[PDB]
Design a protein around this ligand. Structure first.
Ligand SMILES: [Zn+2]
Lengths: 14, 147
C-alpha cells in the first residue's frame, strides 16, 4: 500500500 | 501492508490499523472491535464501531487516478492546520481539472470536511479515495488518456 502523509499531532488548548 | 483504517474517538480522525485484538457486542447487531493503531501502542487502543468506524484503507491518489475523484464523493483528506495535520473524512464540492505534467496531476479539489464543515482547495497529494470508487478507472479510461 502507498504511504500516507505523516500525521502531525497537537494537544490543542490555544 | 496495512489493509484497514479506523476512526479514533479522540479526534474523529482516521488512522491505519495495525491489528484487531478482540471483538464484542456482535449479538447486538452493532459489534465493536479492539483496535491497535499503526505506530501507536497499547495506550492508544480503542473499542471502535465495526460497521461505521472501521473500513478498508483509503487509497492515496496518484497521476490519472484523479478521474475517479468526483464532486459528491466522500474522500479521506489530509487536513493541514496551524499545529496539526490529520486525515479526516471530507466531501468533494468541486473538481477543477487541469493539465497534467511531469509530476502528474495538477487538478484542484474544493472539499468540505465532515466534522468541522471547513472548506479548502487541495491538490491530489492530500486526497485518499475509497476503494469503492475504483470502478471509475475502468469507465473513464479515455479521460485518463486525455489527462
Ligand atoms: Zn488530475
Amino acid at each position: 500500500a502507498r504511504t500516507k502523509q505523516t500525521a502531525r499531532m497537537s494537544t490543542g488548548g490555544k | 501492508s496495512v489493509e484497514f483504517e479506523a476512526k479514533s474517538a479522540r479526534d474523529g480522525a482516521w488512522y491505519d490499523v495495525a491489528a484487531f485484538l478482540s471483538h464484542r457486542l456482535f449479538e447486538s447487531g452493532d459489534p465493536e472491535v479492539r483496535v491497535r493503531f499503526s505506530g501507536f501502542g497499547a495506550e492508544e487502543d480503542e473499542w471502535i464501531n465495526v460497521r461505521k468506524c472501521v473500513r478498508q484503507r483509503s487509497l492515496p491518489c496518484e497521476a490519472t487516478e484523479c478521474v475517479a475523484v468526483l464532486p459528491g464523493d466522500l474522500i479521506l483528506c489530509f487536513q493541514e492546520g496551524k499545529d496539526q495535520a490529520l486525515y479526516y473524512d471530507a466531501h468533494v464540492l468541486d473538481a477543477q481539472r487541469r493539465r497534467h505534467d511531469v509530476r502528474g496531476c495538477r487538478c484542484r479539489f474544493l472539499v468540505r470536511y465532515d466534522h468541522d464543515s471547513s472548506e479548502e482547495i487541495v491538490p491530489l497529494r492530500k486526497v485518499c479515495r475509497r476503494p469503492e470508487t475504483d470502478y471509475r478507472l475502468q469507465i473513464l479510461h479515455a479521460a485518463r488518456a486525455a489527462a
